[PDB]
Amino acid sequence: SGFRKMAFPSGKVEGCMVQVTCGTTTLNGLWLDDVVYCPRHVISNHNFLVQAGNVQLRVIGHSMQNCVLKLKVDTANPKTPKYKFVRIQPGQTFSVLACYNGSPSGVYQCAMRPNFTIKGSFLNGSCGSVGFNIDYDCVSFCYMHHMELPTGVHAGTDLEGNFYGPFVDRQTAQAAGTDTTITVNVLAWLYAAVINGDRWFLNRFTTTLNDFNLVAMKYNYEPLTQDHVDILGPLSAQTGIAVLDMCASLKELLQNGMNGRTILGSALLEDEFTPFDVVRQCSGVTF
Amino acid sequence: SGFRKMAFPSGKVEGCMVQVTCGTTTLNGLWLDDVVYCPRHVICTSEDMLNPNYEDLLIRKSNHNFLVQAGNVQLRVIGHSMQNCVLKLKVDTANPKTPKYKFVRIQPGQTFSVLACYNGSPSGVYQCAMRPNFTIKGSFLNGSCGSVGFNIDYDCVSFCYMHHMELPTGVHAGTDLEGNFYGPFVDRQTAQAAGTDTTITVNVLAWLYAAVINGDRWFLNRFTTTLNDFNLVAMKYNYEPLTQDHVDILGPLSAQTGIAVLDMCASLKELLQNGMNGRTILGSALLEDEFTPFDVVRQCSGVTF
Numbered sequence: 001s002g003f004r005k006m007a008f009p010s011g012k013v014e015g016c017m018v019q020v021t022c023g024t025t026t027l028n029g030l031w032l033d034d035v036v037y038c039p040r041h042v043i044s045n046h047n048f049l050v051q052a053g054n055v056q057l058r059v060i061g062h063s064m065q066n067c068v069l070k071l072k073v074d075t076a077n078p079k080t081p082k083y084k085f086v087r088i089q090p091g092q093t094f095s096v097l098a099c100y101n102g103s104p105s106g107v108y109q110c111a112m113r114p115n116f117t118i119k120g121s122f123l124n125g126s127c128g129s130v131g132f133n134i135d136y137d138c139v140s141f142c143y144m145h146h147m148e149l150p151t152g153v154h155a156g157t158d159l160e161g162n163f164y165g166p167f168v169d170r171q172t173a174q175a176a177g178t179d180t181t182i183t184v185n186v187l188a189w190l191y192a193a194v195i196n197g198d199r200w201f202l203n204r205f206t207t208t209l210n211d212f213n214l215v216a217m218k219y220n221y222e223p224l225t226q227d228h229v230d231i232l233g234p235l236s237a238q239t240g241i242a243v244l245d246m247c248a249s250l251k252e253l254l255q256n257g258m259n260g261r262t263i264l265g266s267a268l269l270e271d272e273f274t275p276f277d278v279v280r281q282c283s284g285v286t287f
Numbered sequence: 288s289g290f291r292k293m294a295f296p297s298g299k300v301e302g303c304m305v306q307v308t309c310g311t312t313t314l315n316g317l318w319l320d321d322v323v324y325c326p327r328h329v330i331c332t333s334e335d336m337l338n339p340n341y342e343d344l345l346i347r348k349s350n351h352n353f354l355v356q357a358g359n360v361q362l363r364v365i366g367h368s369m370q371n372c373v374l375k376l377k378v379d380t381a382n383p384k385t386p387k388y389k390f391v392r393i394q395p396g397q398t399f400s401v402l403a404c405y406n407g408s409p410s411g412v413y414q415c416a417m418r419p420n421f422t423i424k425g426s427f428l429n430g431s432c433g434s435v436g437f438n439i440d441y442d443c444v445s446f447c448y449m450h451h452m453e454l455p456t457g458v459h460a461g462t463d464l465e466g467n468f469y470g471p472f473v474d475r476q477t478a479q480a481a482g483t484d485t486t487i488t489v490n491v492l493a494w495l496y497a498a499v500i501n502g503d504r505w506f507l508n509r510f511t512t513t514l515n516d517f518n519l520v521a522m523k524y525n526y527e528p529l530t531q532d533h534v535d536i537l538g539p540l541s542a543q544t545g546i547a548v549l550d551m552c553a554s555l556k557e558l559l560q561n562g563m564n565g566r567t568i569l570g571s572a573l574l575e576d577e578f579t580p581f582d583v584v585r586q587c588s589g590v591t592f
């Protein structure tokens with residue numbers, strides 16, 4: 001029992017964090033094999049100082065790929081795990097290992113918002129901090145932190161240097177677009193509540209996908225597609241509540257609120273747990 | 288900017304997780320130097336759990352009855368002893384990944400990271416607090432016994448909790464790393480229940496100071512309160528009494544924001560009376576009590592926005 005915002009164990013990523021200094025700027029780098037990946041806004045080989053713990057790495061080459069700088073070093077990282085670079089979609093979740101001066105300070109779980117920003121927790125020196133998921137023994141790197149926006153939210157790139165969202169890497173007038181709620185994630189979290197014995201919000205009603213989307217559009221909720229309904233299939237079979245049966249419950253919560261009640265200890269509808277996160281946390285998948 | 292429930296990086300602890308098997312029971316162990324620490328109920332059957340005599344069960348065991356697995360390598364058990372509710376298995380190999388560590392017993396209101404494990408394999412990490420009723424609101428399934436709670440200050444891991452059981456209300460109970468339970472719990476399947484829980488007042492105040500640091504002041508008012516009047520109001524909402532120690536501990540956050548502790552206590556009184564009126568504080572519609580004054584100073588910027 002219990003339901004927490006759970007991050008993946010960060011150990012495989014901690015063994016890759018380095019400090020990158022160019023002139024007066026200091027930020028974080030990701031050391032994989034003989035390459036150090038970091039935001040290009042950090043800017044010859046000896047101008048770049050790379051520090052791994054208390055050891056100085058010697059830079060022997062440099063190249064740029066989109067908004068990421070690739071520093072060729074003379075030493076392969078002996079702690080390099082099995083890895084892939086993957087680009088995630090809005091609504092998908094990941095773990096963030098927040099670092100300062102190449103030293104990891106914390107780990108938290110978060111989601112890529114529909115407006116491509118992340119509601120993270122970062123301070124000056126956090127640039128180069130990475131987002132990831134783990135599937136068996138393979139680390140899938142999906143995010144590298146680049147900047148904070150005026151509303152306190154964060155923007156960054158995949159590990160190939162391509163930004164998530166209509167953002168650029170520079171000090172200019174940039175604002176996050178109007179955000180929306182990740183509907184498929186709210187439904188997954190309602191199924192997690194039923195699994196943990198919280199059923200006060202269930203009702204006898206069912207709805208159509210079209211009627212649900214007409215209502216959900218009024219509350220700044222993302223449209224629910226047939227793919228989302230298919231993805232919620234396992235949780236629907238486990239609890240006995242059809243997806244459009246659960247949509248009628250969410251429609252009632254949207255038009256009436258919670259009436260002083262909570263769901264999984266929350267007074268707001270939670271959207272940062274995917275259908276896969278719910279199944280994984282209510283099963284026991286290890287790495 | 289931003290404020291998240293942050294756990295410590297779990298790497299130093301992952302390198303200590305092993306699987307302990309005794310008969311048909313399998314749970315997690317903590318491998319530090321040449322000792323594996325695990326719940327003593329690993330020697331029990333489900334039948335034994337009603338009234339287990341651990342001393343009688345342990346005397347019937349020899350070293351080779353305990354199977355310890357570290358990754359894909361079998362560790363050889365060369366000794367065993369019991370310390371309160373924890374079993375200490377002496378093994379023939381020191382853990383090469385043993386970090387700098389201490390065993391610390393925490394008090395209610397303190398926070399820590401939990402590395403949830405199954406079969407000696409870590410599956411996730413989350414942050415939580417020792418509740419005033421000595422339980423933890425964790426997320427654990429069958430096989431999670433032996434998972435540990437910790438803090439990492441500097442490069443030293445302070446182990447403070449080892450998971451032993453789930454109570455009927457879904458909450459969790461466990462011990463420090465010396466085998467002493469937190470709370471009036473026993474490692475028996477007895478009809479024992481968690482006492483009435485209360486809100487950690489000093490942590491809610493710390494989180495209100497964190498909101499002011501991140502630029503939010505909608506909840507402040509022009510009033511103050513005496514400590515006694517604050518406690519008479521707070522105890523009506525099931526909030527823990529605020530002591531002079533708590534007021535002293537909030538000193539740095541008060542000096543950083545310019546809001547006296549008792550002026551922050553007046554805002555809290557008003558928040559309890561009025562609710563939030565559709566507003567949120569640090570993205571939350573409830574008053575958050577799982578961030579200590581120390582966590583706020585560690586996570587927030589030293590410059591108030």
Ligand SMILES: CCCNC(=O)CN1C[C@@H](C(=O)Nc2cncc3cc(F)ccc23)c2cc(Cl)ccc2C1=O
Pocket residue numbers: 001328336427428429430431432451452453454455459473474475476
């Ligand atoms: C109400 C669920 C737990 N009760 C059981 O079915 C049996 N149970 C086994 C064990 C225990 O509590 N194990 C678990 C520990 N954390 C999360 C669990 C979650 C789950 F679903 C099942 C088991 C869990 C235990 C140990 C001790 Cl010291 C005292 C009593 C027990 C005990 O009662």
Ligand SMILES: [Cl-]
Pocket residue numbers: 392393394397
């Ligand atoms: Cl403490």
